[PDB]
């Protein structure tokens, strides 16, 4: 009944906004958690049984409210929308931001009252009411969005505070679905607030449907192609063409330029650059206006500074510089007053507002409180504020603006930013504070060599996660200007060939010093191909390469072999949890042996190989001497490599300090090979047999291998076995005879009380080992514990026994 | 050929292609040498000096992503001159590589079998580049390819370069207007480019073979042969074609369709 008249009211509201019906191209909805707006709210019992809500996210400044409006209008018109709901209410929190305690507020234009009590009565059985609330970022006040002190009534007819009524309605007993839109700046207030929500990311213009948007916005022949292709030829503005606000601002910003002609791609570098160009294009024939711009400026920023984003139909402006210039501004900014639809005046998406806030400090307060208040929830995240601040403080733009606007700008702020950078260098709580990514954004937006160098000097290690090509470009820019950065860990979240090629040609300029990690990231088929050509040029390159759990396959093998040949700087290279099945281990080993490489570590842990390559491992181990640390950790090998295992070290001068081992098969032969290596090979410091089906006879012949004196074997381990409690006695006695090792571990070994009793006696009398011993997971009787706890305090030679549980 | 085979052989055979001074051809047919084993193949070929003559990658499930490596090894080596890539899973987007294989003379690649390709125009443009530039390029076995009238038109435009020595040629599958064949015949008349040609599943119409038989009738364009198969064309075409060979045996044979 009530549905129909307001579905036409919302149609009238969102049809006129620009149109925008034939002016829209679909953006991308993504939920990875390692889309289709239709049936967005499955409560299906896969992973989302009790959920009631979703949060929209995405890149900075999608116009997100526009997408909320598109969903609203799409339901209002239907368009194959199976009506799971009877009402979707658009909340424009940019207005609801007031401190006034308001009840259920379904009226907006103050029309005749909605049937509020029968609306409450059509609640209990059908949960077909939904509230599309938007602009959560603009809940103003005192940045007080913590847990609500007092709840509200279910009837919602009480005019309680939205802090104390609406928020708790979201919190407990919501009874309706929920979709909120905001940026990931400082939301956790609402997420440590229990909601059991999901989140979905929104992604802007890809190339093809950005071209579609250009065709739909422009006329099909006047500027649909030539402008598109001329800005394609720009090495930039295609990085930002992904962002929808940039596309909307270049589409609206270029229809004024055919009257001028051939002034499209000029002075287009960064978001600040394009915003300044667009503002200058709008304000070209205005100069009189020198005071009008200053008057509007010195008042716009207070919308978020004093945190009154709403201007009250611009009555504060009526105080400050109210002339026909205001009419001109509204005429060129049609989306200022019309969105409120009754009396009220505002800005489009507060982005030009933050640009005017940057203008404020450009013209002439104190920078101390702003930088202290950076990213908070009182002055409005300051994200785009500081973004434009950095974009402007570029010295060439400084001179241009100080000449254009007849304004003095302070250079102290540059130092202030510097100070800020050391502070966030020393801020250890980087998980819940602004990341390194927006710092990279800013330093890129300000394009100063020495300043970027000094900013990077405070950071010896980088942790970022790329989402936009803008992220790729800013990362490339900052990293190619680093000298005090050691480790470079990068998070790829997907062409990538040229991106990472730039990312590590930055390392080709990082010849001062660098270290690299690329772990838990899926390097594609050319993802293998990156960093190979990068390591293929001489100079100063990475001392230590990491590829662990990365999306990786056989293809990398030849590549890395090549770089292992051409590299004179790598000392270790890790290949962990990556599907380097087999015969790529052959490519690895041929790359290692063929040239002379200064490789130190070599980790093949959990690489699904077999014994059929161990012979090649032994060949390369015999050939090379630089390699001395060779983990093959508990991959899919075992027995039948045993002869190879032995003949790796059949002679001295092998130089293999540690040798991690594998979940093996038939114990006897492999441990016999281990005895051969132990009795013959020098400087064999570790032997990490772990989680292995090794028997009592196996470990017995192992200690027989220890019987060879003058064998220097440090820390050793036998994890899993079932021995008679004399074998441990043999190993302890043989340590007493010769101080072979330093510590040992016994893991899931079922040994019995008498075992540790013999252990503690033999260590009690001039202890066998001299450093440590580790015992875990036994339910043995407690007089063993008393003996063990006794012995260390009288003799600290056995510095520690790992206590089981007590 | 058709042997149970996979990527592993690639490095192996590269090694023996390096250490062998007796092999002159090596065939890898119908065997699942998918990709990057073609890289192992090509590095084995180029790294040492090998007296390899044939190289068949027919029906090996590769993509354009290795064609660049094929071109590199082809440029490096000169012994290899007979390189079938027969109708495997490549096509367009290798086109620039296809051209730059033979972008200069002294490539020494006599025959070059081709593949069921994709976008005709660019690949046949590369074919025109090779035809106009490369010497001793004797065959070009485009077969069962989605090649268009514009494609084969620019191909005969590639034939327009005189002094280009291209022997036996083939265009198997296409749908042309019956003046394109006239252009190729006239350009053969202008310069004795090739010796024979095949037209396979080409739907050409009666007028096509009529123009063909007239132009061959008057000082025949080709000099060796011509093969036509699977047409249901009207029979006065057959009478003209059966007539012309007995008076002029220059066109030694036209493959009779069914009668």
PDB file of N, CA, C and O in Angstrom, chain A residues 529 554-555 558 582-583 586-587 590, chain B residues 7-8 11-12 35-36 39-40 43:
ATOM      1  N   UNK A 529      58.296 -14.910 -14.697  1.00  0.00           N
ATOM      2  CA  UNK A 529      59.182 -14.198 -15.607  1.00  0.00           C
ATOM      3  C   UNK A 529      59.653 -12.873 -15.027  1.00  0.00           C
ATOM      4  O   UNK A 529      60.719 -12.385 -15.405  1.00  0.00           O
ATOM      5  N   UNK A 554      56.635 -25.268 -12.370  1.00  0.00           N
ATOM      6  CA  UNK A 554      57.877 -25.738 -12.967  1.00  0.00           C
ATOM      7  C   UNK A 554      58.556 -24.652 -13.787  1.00  0.00           C
ATOM      8  O   UNK A 554      59.785 -24.645 -13.908  1.00  0.00           O
ATOM      9  N   UNK A 555      57.774 -23.736 -14.363  1.00  0.00           N
ATOM     10  CA  UNK A 555      58.313 -22.783 -15.328  1.00  0.00           C
ATOM     11  C   UNK A 555      59.431 -21.942 -14.722  1.00  0.00           C
ATOM     12  O   UNK A 555      60.429 -21.646 -15.390  1.00  0.00           O
ATOM     13  N   UNK A 558      63.888 -23.107 -14.892  1.00  0.00           N
ATOM     14  CA  UNK A 558      64.854 -22.600 -15.868  1.00  0.00           C
ATOM     15  C   UNK A 558      65.189 -21.124 -15.664  1.00  0.00           C
ATOM     16  O   UNK A 558      66.362 -20.732 -15.689  1.00  0.00           O
ATOM     17  N   UNK A 582      59.105 -31.688 -10.082  1.00  0.00           N
ATOM     18  CA  UNK A 582      60.338 -32.421 -10.325  1.00  0.00           C
ATOM     19  C   UNK A 582      60.836 -31.996 -11.695  1.00  0.00           C
ATOM     20  O   UNK A 582      60.095 -31.394 -12.478  1.00  0.00           O
ATOM     21  N   UNK A 583      62.122 -32.258 -11.945  1.00  0.00           N
ATOM     22  CA  UNK A 583      62.796 -31.959 -13.205  1.00  0.00           C
ATOM     23  C   UNK A 583      62.984 -30.454 -13.322  1.00  0.00           C
ATOM     24  O   UNK A 583      63.859 -29.963 -14.052  1.00  0.00           O
ATOM     25  N   UNK A 586      65.898 -30.431 -11.439  1.00  0.00           N
ATOM     26  CA  UNK A 586      67.003 -30.566 -12.379  1.00  0.00           C
ATOM     27  C   UNK A 586      67.388 -29.223 -12.973  1.00  0.00           C
ATOM     28  O   UNK A 586      68.580 -28.915 -13.097  1.00  0.00           O
ATOM     29  N   UNK A 587      66.407 -28.418 -13.380  1.00  0.00           N
ATOM     30  CA  UNK A 587      66.779 -27.111 -13.917  1.00  0.00           C
ATOM     31  C   UNK A 587      67.508 -26.281 -12.862  1.00  0.00           C
ATOM     32  O   UNK A 587      68.524 -25.634 -13.151  1.00  0.00           O
ATOM     33  N   UNK A 590      71.167 -27.717 -12.467  1.00  0.00           N
ATOM     34  CA  UNK A 590      72.054 -27.396 -13.576  1.00  0.00           C
ATOM     35  C   UNK A 590      72.404 -25.914 -13.551  1.00  0.00           C
ATOM     36  O   UNK A 590      73.559 -25.534 -13.771  1.00  0.00           O
TER      37      UNK A 590
ATOM     38  N   UNK B   7      56.497 -32.863 -21.290  1.00  0.00           N
ATOM     39  CA  UNK B   7      57.449 -31.765 -21.192  1.00  0.00           C
ATOM     40  C   UNK B   7      58.844 -32.255 -20.836  1.00  0.00           C
ATOM     41  O   UNK B   7      59.837 -31.627 -21.218  1.00  0.00           O
ATOM     42  N   UNK B   8      58.938 -33.365 -20.100  1.00  0.00           N
ATOM     43  CA  UNK B   8      60.216 -33.795 -19.542  1.00  0.00           C
ATOM     44  C   UNK B   8      61.255 -34.024 -20.632  1.00  0.00           C
ATOM     45  O   UNK B   8      62.435 -33.695 -20.457  1.00  0.00           O
ATOM     46  N   UNK B  11      64.148 -30.761 -22.133  1.00  0.00           N
ATOM     47  CA  UNK B  11      65.531 -30.593 -21.686  1.00  0.00           C
ATOM     48  C   UNK B  11      66.453 -31.712 -22.168  1.00  0.00           C
ATOM     49  O   UNK B  11      67.560 -31.453 -22.657  1.00  0.00           O
ATOM     50  N   UNK B  12      66.040 -32.965 -21.974  1.00  0.00           N
ATOM     51  CA  UNK B  12      66.780 -34.115 -22.489  1.00  0.00           C
ATOM     52  C   UNK B  12      67.181 -33.938 -23.951  1.00  0.00           C
ATOM     53  O   UNK B  12      68.365 -34.020 -24.314  1.00  0.00           O
ATOM     54  N   UNK B  35      54.235 -26.395 -23.655  1.00  0.00           N
ATOM     55  CA  UNK B  35      54.905 -25.119 -23.847  1.00  0.00           C
ATOM     56  C   UNK B  35      56.044 -25.070 -22.845  1.00  0.00           C
ATOM     57  O   UNK B  35      56.093 -25.865 -21.903  1.00  0.00           O
ATOM     58  N   UNK B  36      56.996 -24.168 -23.103  1.00  0.00           N
ATOM     59  CA  UNK B  36      58.166 -23.935 -22.259  1.00  0.00           C
ATOM     60  C   UNK B  36      59.117 -25.115 -22.393  1.00  0.00           C
ATOM     61  O   UNK B  36      60.325 -25.009 -22.132  1.00  0.00           O
ATOM     62  N   UNK B  39      60.611 -23.889 -25.274  1.00  0.00           N
ATOM     63  CA  UNK B  39      61.763 -23.105 -24.845  1.00  0.00           C
ATOM     64  C   UNK B  39      62.973 -23.990 -24.607  1.00  0.00           C
ATOM     65  O   UNK B  39      64.091 -23.639 -25.004  1.00  0.00           O
ATOM     66  N   UNK B  40      62.791 -25.126 -23.931  1.00  0.00           N
ATOM     67  CA  UNK B  40      63.949 -25.994 -23.736  1.00  0.00           C
ATOM     68  C   UNK B  40      64.509 -26.462 -25.079  1.00  0.00           C
ATOM     69  O   UNK B  40      65.728 -26.469 -25.292  1.00  0.00           O
ATOM     70  N   UNK B  43      66.426 -23.435 -26.743  1.00  0.00           N
ATOM     71  CA  UNK B  43      67.710 -23.133 -26.125  1.00  0.00           C
ATOM     72  C   UNK B  43      68.716 -24.228 -26.448  1.00  0.00           C
ATOM     73  O   UNK B  43      69.881 -23.945 -26.753  1.00  0.00           O
TER      74      UNK B  43
END
